[PDB]
Structures are given as C-alpha cells and as structure tokens.
C-alpha cells in the first residue's frame, strides 16, 4: 500500500468516491418520482464503480509494467476500466435531461467507447512513437462528442422547460472543461512524454475525477430539472 509515493492520492480518491456514493444513495431513498429515480440510479452508480477501481489501484491490483523507452514503466490500467463504464453513464445523464433521440445517444456512447478503448491501447503499446498515434485517434473521438454536446444538444435544450435548459447549460460547460483536460495530462505524464512524474499526474487525475463525478452529481441531483412537472 505504501512504497509508492502516489499512494496518498489513491487513498484520498478512494475515500472521496466512497463518501460520494454513500451520500447519493441516502439522498436517493424515498424518491418516488419515476423520472428522478432514473437520474439517481445512473448518477449513484458512477462513483460506486470509480470507488472499486480506485481501491484496486490503492492495493496494487490495477497496475502493470510496460517497457518503452528502454525502461519499465508503471501503467495503472484500472483507470481505463473505470472510464469505460463511467463516462457513458455521465453522457446518458446529459442526454436524458434534454430527451435526445435514440440515434444521437447511440452515436455518443459509441464514440465514447472508441475514445476510451483507443486510450487503453495507446497506454499498453510498447513502440514509443505509436502511443501517440493512438492518442490522436482517441482525441479525435472526443472532439466529436464535444461537438454533439454543442450542436445536437444545446439546440434542443433551449426548446424545453427553463429549469431543464438552465441545468443542462451548467452541466454541459462543466463537462467540456473537465473532459478536455484529460488528454493533456496523459500527454505530459508518465504515459506519454514523461515531463510530469507519476505522483503529480496521480494528484491531477484525482482532482479531475472527483470533480467530474461527485461534483457533477451534486449539481444535477439538487436541481428541479430531474423531476417531472406535476401538481
Ligand atoms: C465505506 C463505503 C464504501 C462505498 C460503498 C461501496 C460501493 C460498492 C457497494 C455497493 C453497490 C450499492 C448499490 C449501487 C447502485 C445504487 C443505485 C441506486 O441507488 O438507485 C436508486 C434508484 O432510485 C433505485 O430505483
Ligand atoms: C452499469 C455497468 C456496471 C459495470 C460494473 C462492471 C465492473 C467489473 C469490474 C472488474 C473486473 C475486471 C478485471 C479485468 C480482468 C484482468 C485480469 C488479468 O488478466 O490479470 C490482471 C492481473 O491479475 C492484475 O494486474
Ligand atoms: C462497455 C461500454 C458499453 C456498455 C456500457 C453501458 C453504458 C450505458 C448504456 C447504454 C446506451 C444505449 C442506449 C440506451 C439509451 C436509452 C434511453 C432512451 O432513449 O429512452 C428509452 C426509454 O424507453 C424511454 O422511456
Ligand atoms: C479542445 C480541447 C482539447 C484539446 C486537447 C488537444 C491538445 C493539443 C496537443 C498538444 C501540443 C502540446 C505538445 C507539447 C509536447 C512537447 C514535449 C517536449 O518534447 O518537450 C520536452 C520538455 O519540455 C523538456 O523539459
Ligand atoms: C471519470 C471522469 C472523466 C471525466 C473521464 C474522462 C476521460 C477522458 C476524457 C479520457 C480521454 C483520453 C483521450 C481523449 C486521449 C488520451 C487518453 C485518454 C483516454 C485519457
């Protein structure tokens, strides 16, 4: 558990995802409105999955060594298993808020799976120059997602209840800003060019992970948008 200088950030991350899961679970009790239940279920699952994968990194299961640049490099592969299942759920929270059509949802979840799966391939690739080829396909998939969130969602939200429009626009903005930092941390951290050491990279991903999952949920689940309009 100790011996790895990043361990303090993995321990903190685990604690914050556990506490976030327990909070949403308790808040979610008794909610009867069928629409709100769907938002509670999706949004509580996100930190529950991330809690289990942070714990696996803490205990050292979610780590493997990958040779490249003539050295053995520690790669936390458990990050991608986490993101494979949590990032489509976050996009589903947004798409259900604006009642997106089924074709649009499919396009978003599919592009997201491509983004995370090519990120994983790049992380495990042993030929140094090819890691950046995968990084660029993965980043291209993420630019399609952000485009849909602005031209495919923002246009629909504005034709809906004001409480829905308002909450979507805050969540959309939060999403665009936090998600776009991820490819940058990868590129300058241990998986890429290696300018930032692993212990600081782990700190940066931990602040982004907690903000984009627990912070995101705090904003959505206090809104009136998730309830049906009723007397
Ligand atoms: C120290 C605490 C550690 C953190 C806890 C360990 C996390 C792993 C455990 C459990 C999964 C529990 C259920 C996760 C799914 C919750 C979904 C939900 O609550 O949905 C409510 C909805 O309203 C219903 O219809
Ligand atoms: C709504 C969707 C909910 C989704 C919830 C699903 C979460 C599944 C989690 C984990 C097991 C996956 C572990 C992958 C198996 C790797 C085992 C292996 O081959 O060796 C690794 C080595 O033991 C160590 O470094
Ligand atoms: C491993 C990576 C892939 C699996 C990870 C799971 C991620 C989330 C699941 C699904 C999106 C598929 C489309 C589901 C959208 C349906 C929402 C909808 O359109 O509404 C239908 C409902 O009938 C109205 O009441
Ligand atoms: C739209 C929101 C998401 C956009 C995300 C796409 C970001 C574009 C990528 C890269 C330029 C930075 C490349 C700089 C890398 C040079 C590293 C180097 O070789 O320098 C060694 C070091 O500086 C000696 O100390
Ligand atoms: C659970 C939290 C969130 C916000 C996860 C998001 C992760 C990404 C947006 C990852 C993107 C990557 C790309 C675009 C290219 C480099 C490799 C990554 C997989 C980190």
Give 181 Cα–ligand 1 centroid separation in angstroms.
28
Q: Which ligand is nearest to the CA of 55?
A: 1
CATH fit for domain 7-221, picks 3.40.228.10, 1.20.1440.230, 1.20.1070.10, 3.40.50.300 = 1.20.1070.10
Burial of 6 per CB tally in 10 Å (0-12, 13-18, 19+): buried
Q: Which two tokens stand for residue 117?
A: 């799966």
For residue 66, the cross-strand partners are 73
23, 33, 36, 78, 160 from 57: Cα distances, Å: 23, 37, 33, 7, 42
* Ligand 5 atom nearest to 123, measured from its CA: 17
* 195 in contact with ligand 4, CB cutoff 6 A: yes
CA dist 221 and 27 (Å) reads 9
Cβ(208)–Cβ(185) below 8 Å: yes
Q: Between β-strands 71-75 and 64-68, what pairing exists: parallel, antiparallel or unpaired?
A: antiparallel
CA dist 225 and 96 (Å) reads 11
CA dist 70 and 193 (Å) reads 14
Q: Which of 56, 58, 81, 93 to mutate to test the pocket of ligand 2 (most atoms within 8 A of CB)?
A: 81
Tokens 């040779």, residue located: 67
Give 226 Cα–ligand 3 centroid separation in angstroms.
17
CA dist 87 and 21 (Å) reads 16
What resolution in angstroms, rounded to 1 decimal? 1.7
* 186 in contact with ligand 5, CB cutoff 6 A: yes
27, 102, 220 from 225: Cα distances, Å: 16, 20, 8
Please report the sign of the dihedral spanned by the C-alpha atoms of residue 9, residue 10, residue 11, residue 16: positive
Cβ(109)–Cβ(93) below 8 Å: no
How was this structure obtained?
X-ray
* 77 in contact with ligand 2, CB cutoff 6 A: no
32, 38, 81, 108 from 228: Cα distances, Å: 11, 12, 34, 25
Q: Which of 40, 54, 55, 89 to mutate to test the pocket of ligand 1 (most atoms within 8 A of CB)?
A: 40
């Amino acid at each position: 558990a100790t011996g790895r200088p990043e361990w303090i950030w993995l321990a903190l991350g685990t604690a914050l995802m556990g506490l976030g899961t327990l909070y949403f679970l308790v808040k979610g009790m008794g909610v009867s409105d069928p629409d709100a239940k769907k938002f509670y279920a999706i949004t509580t699952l996100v930190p529950a999955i991330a809690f289990t994968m942070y714990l696996s990194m803490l205990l050292g299961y979610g780590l493997t060594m990958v040779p490249f640049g003539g050295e053995q490099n520690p790669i936390y592969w458990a990050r991608y298993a986490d993101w494979l299942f949590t990032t489509p759920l976050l996009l589903l929270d947004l798409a259900l808020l604006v009642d997106a059509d089924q074709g649009t949802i499919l396009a978003l979840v599919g592009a997201d799976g491509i983004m995370i799966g090519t990120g994983l391939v790049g992380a495990l690739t042993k030929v140094y120059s090819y890691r950046f080829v995968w990084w660029a396909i993965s980043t291209a998939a993420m630019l399609y997602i952000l485009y849909v969130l602005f031209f495919g969602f923002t246009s629909k939200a504005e034709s809906m209840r004001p409480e829905v429009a308002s909450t979507f626009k805050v969540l959309r903005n939060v999403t665009v800003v936090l998600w776009s930092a991820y490819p940058v941390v990868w590129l300058i951290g241990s998986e890429g060019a290696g300018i930032v050491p692993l212990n600081i990279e782990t700190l940066l991903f931990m602040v982004l992970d907690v903000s984009a999952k627990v912070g995101f949920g705090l904003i959505l689940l206090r809104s009136r948008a998730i309830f049906g309009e009723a007397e």
